Amino acid sequence: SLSKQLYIGGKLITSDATTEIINPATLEIVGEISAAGINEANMALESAQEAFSSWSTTPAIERAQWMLKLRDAVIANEQHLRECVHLEMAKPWQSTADDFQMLVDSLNFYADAIVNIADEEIKDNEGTHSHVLSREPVGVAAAFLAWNFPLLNLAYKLGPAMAAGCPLVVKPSSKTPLSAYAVGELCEQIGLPAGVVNILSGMDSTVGDAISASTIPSVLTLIGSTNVGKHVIATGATSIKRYSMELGGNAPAIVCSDANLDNAADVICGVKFANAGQICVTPNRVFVHESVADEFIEKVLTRAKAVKVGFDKNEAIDMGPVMDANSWQRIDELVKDAQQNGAQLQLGGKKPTGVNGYFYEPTVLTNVDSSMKIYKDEIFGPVISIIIFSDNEQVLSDANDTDAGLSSFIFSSNEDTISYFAKHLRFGEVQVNGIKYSINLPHFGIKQSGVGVDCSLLALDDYLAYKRVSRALKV
Amino acid sequence: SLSKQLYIGGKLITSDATTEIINPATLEIVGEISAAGINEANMALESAQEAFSSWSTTPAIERAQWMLKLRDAVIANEQHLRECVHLEMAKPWQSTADDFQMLVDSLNFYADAIVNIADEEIKDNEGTHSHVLSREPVGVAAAFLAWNFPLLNLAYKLGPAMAAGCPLVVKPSSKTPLSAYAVGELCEQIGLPAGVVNILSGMDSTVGDAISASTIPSVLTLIGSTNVGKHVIATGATSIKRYSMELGGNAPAIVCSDANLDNAADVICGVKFANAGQICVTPNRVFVHESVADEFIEKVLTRAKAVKVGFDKNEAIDMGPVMDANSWQRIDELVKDAQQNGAQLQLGGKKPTGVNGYFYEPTVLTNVDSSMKIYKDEIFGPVISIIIFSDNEQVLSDANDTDAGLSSFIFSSNEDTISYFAKHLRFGEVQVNGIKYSINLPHFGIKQSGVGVDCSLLALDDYLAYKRVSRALKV
Ligand SMILES: NC(=O)c1ccc[n+]([C@@H]2O[C@H](COP(=O)([O-])OP(=O)(O)OC[C@H]3O[C@@H](n4cnc5c(N)ncnc54)[C@H](OP(=O)(O)O)[C@@H]3O)[C@@H](O)[C@H]2O)c1
Ligand SMILES: NC(=O)c1ccc[n+]([C@@H]2O[C@H](COP(=O)([O-])OP(=O)(O)OC[C@H]3O[C@@H](n4cnc5c(N)ncnc54)[C@H](OP(=O)(O)O)[C@@H]3O)[C@@H](O)[C@H]2O)c1
């Protein structure tokens, strides 16, 4: 049941080609999917377009019931969905719960949110007209998803698009498409109307470019890198479209003099090694003060040494391997470039001895400065990069010394210090003394980290168009 | 006082080039401006960027005081501002009040709006963290403005950008730059901080493309045509930017059998001949039922024949000329092409004899059908294009048979017909039995009419970025 077909137009159809999924830990074939071509891409766009007139006029409560029906099928098929993520990217068995649960959480949140949307009246200052502001479905939506959270990233778009009445064309990453294809099988099982949801994977220069260049979609959304976001914006300029982009980050983490070093180490290591550091909001530059530098490093090394690395559903594995060889080499060249410029390797910086798979050990780097490539670029790996600072006003300028604008962290027990950083940090998210994300809390970045919001009620703004109906009262 | 210079970096500077302004009625040189080049365009972008650190950190109340101080200078120079609009495009003196008053209304609305912005807390469903959602200035904003309302189009962007703390680079139309250059003189007069507002006019291939392709602006906004919107989106893809575009329209106006014909003729003729029909929300296709066809045309003709056409500050002129020869020729070709395919010319259709200037007479055309070019394309002139329908469901499909999604009009006395069209009309605005626009009422389009809103509190959304501050409660 791991040889899955395309879900286009409410039907499970096969392809002209085929792509196999290879597990990055065992490097064996774990499944195959029917790969889409330009013809299959146009088939999904046309079926999504034809379904707009009926799906957008379907009452919100009826759409919400279709979402809850898919949610019931997702809960019933929990083991298969988590196993799909487990096999396609060697994600630890317990961390696959985050992917699966977010899909249930998203379907629940936006089924309930859409039935609470109400029109609003605008006051006429002249007393000559009445005005009613309503919200309606925009059109077809197309989504390109990163591979780091296959089902979570899918949930961020599937939930809102279904609730807002927008037929959706999903393109999962060719590296992790099995779990999304399984969701399409669930929509075919419950009998979801044709064209509402379409799931296909294919080559970027053909399938992906064709979906963006098409004049059918009204909204293009991407969870990925900044460079691909620029390409999608330019490629989609064949028509006027909405863009919702959640792109790369370079999160600073500031551990101050008065910070709880045990809490800062627990939080930082927890998210630096979960998903092998392949997380958009994880710290990329760990700023540590002089007076607590040596004490904070000893705490991070102890936690890093206690990270269970491997690939086994039966075992309590904490961290798996990175996605593929390109990721492994990119991370390794950043660690090795830092050492040649004076950085000190305290732990890791290599693959375990004689191990099969693209595993990278929990790495701890010190003596990092602003001129190194590991400082300017997004690591997206299990590398804790530590920079020593002394002054708060200087570490703030260094923290803002990046084109990214996603997440950021400040660890301190001083209210004047917390207020100072929370205000002047140029990032969409400021985490204070911890980390927290949820389906109801908005996730977003500013500057080059994208435009648009995932989670919370604001995620519906990309899929709903306003309409003002103004009526003359005199005649 | 009709030779004005660039307003860049808080100073009025000259250039090596000059653009002469010709009145489209008298065809005489009425003024001259210092034309900007690529070097001057980079001077404005650099000064706007350097101003962001200080202008964005200026308190909202203090920024609103600068807006009200500019408003006072605007009110003091009301005659000169309306004079520049009157001379650059031959706009009737009575109609120059709309441009002027909207600039005062916009500065008033958004100065009061920015001081009432408040943070919002978000509930944590787990009780482990606190969350505060705030809004902050995004960055530098650049605006390209259409010529049809020089000061009103400037008002829509200047008001929000100043209030939201975003240094603004404005490029007015090369055809109508005098009025905006005078606003920059008022800015230099009151001592507005340097880089907050920059006003330069230049060539599209050089000045306009260098502004979009620059990686400095965070927001690119355009009041113009759809094809230019697509060009700005692609050209701005050198970095991740926000796009706020209010583009072309093709408004249908449905006069049903039960409509007040006197009210429909008053509303349609008023906005069809105001500004010589060079209004984006004006009806482009007038649908009239068979039973009221002969009676509605007679009412429209008597109102069209009563339009005073000319160019005189001391006379109550209702309508002036179109913008230039290209506009005149484009409109004339649509009328002549329509007559070749069966349209009946009832009035106008030509320039008045002997008169100087690009005047086009109030024009009434009947027997228009869906195949004609004047039906598929935006007229943007003083031409009332009349199509006759019989079935309400058919005219609704014809009304929606367009790529545009701006304004739309329904004239009826039946509540079931009004509700039917108000729901199924796929347009941003549905005007019932009249027309209403104001600084507090949102103005926007859907589909290819662009993305983003002008006027209302929603206009601040393009210039304000969110920020979530989450704090662990246990620590
Ligand atoms: N802001 C957030 O919430 C968030 C969340 C997760 C990740 N991220 C960011 O994502 C990045 C890592 O993800 P990644 O390296 O997989 O991103 P990526 O290389 O930019 O790819 C992202 C997705 O876009 C697809 N794609 C690539 N080129 C395309 C084209 N020309 N047309 C259409 N689609 C195309 C890819 O499919 P293929 O895989 O088939 O090429 C992939 O599924 C990091 O920078 C991280 O910061 C951000
Ligand atoms: N939705 C609305 O609220 C609204 C309001 C007003 C008008 N409109 C639309 O605007 C259209 C008529 O205006 P128009 O004929 O002036 O439209 P246009 O030809 O697209 O010009 C719009 C503005 O953009 C500038 N521009 C042109 N090319 C550019 C480039 N490459 N880079 C930067 N800027 C550039 C033009 O400057 P130059 O004049 O110097 O070339 C002009 O000021 C109509 O279709 C109407 O529907 C819409």
Residue numbers in the entry:
A (entry chain E), B (entry chain A): 1 to 475
Wording from the paper:
The first step in processing the free DA monosaccharide that would result from complete depolymerization of carrageenan is performed by a 3,6-anhydro-d-galactose dehydrogenase, which is putatively encoded by the dauA gene (locus tag EU509_08920 in PS47) in the CarPUL of Pseudoalteromonas sp.33. Recombinant DauA displayed activity on DA when using NADP+ as a co-factor. DauA crystallized as a dimer with each monomer of the dimer having a deep NADP+ binding cleft [Fig. 6a and Supplementary Notes (section 5)]. The co-factor binding cleft leads to a tunnel that transits the core of the protein and opens to its opposite surface. Thus, the enzyme(s) associated with this activity remain(s) to be uncovered in Pseudoaltermonas sp. However, the PS47 CarPUL does encode an active NADP+ dependent 3,6-anhydro-d-galactose dehydrogenase (DauA) that would initiate cytoplasmic processing of free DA.
The polysaccharides in red algae (Rhodophyta) are primarily mixed galactan agars such as agarose and carrageenan. Carrageenans are high molecular weight polymers having a linear backbone of repeating D-galactopyranose units (G) linked together by alternating α-1,3 and β-1,4 linkages. Furthermore, transcriptomics revealed upregulation of the CarPUL during growth on ι-carrageenan, while biochemical analysis of eight CarPUL-encoded enzymes revealed carrageenan-specific activity, thus associating the CarPUL with the ability of these pseudoalteromonads to liberate energy from carrageenan. Detailed analysis of the enzyme activities encoded by the CarPUL, combined with interpretation of growth phenotypes, have allowed us to propose a refined and detailed model of κ- and ι-carrageenan processing by some Pseudoalteromonas species.
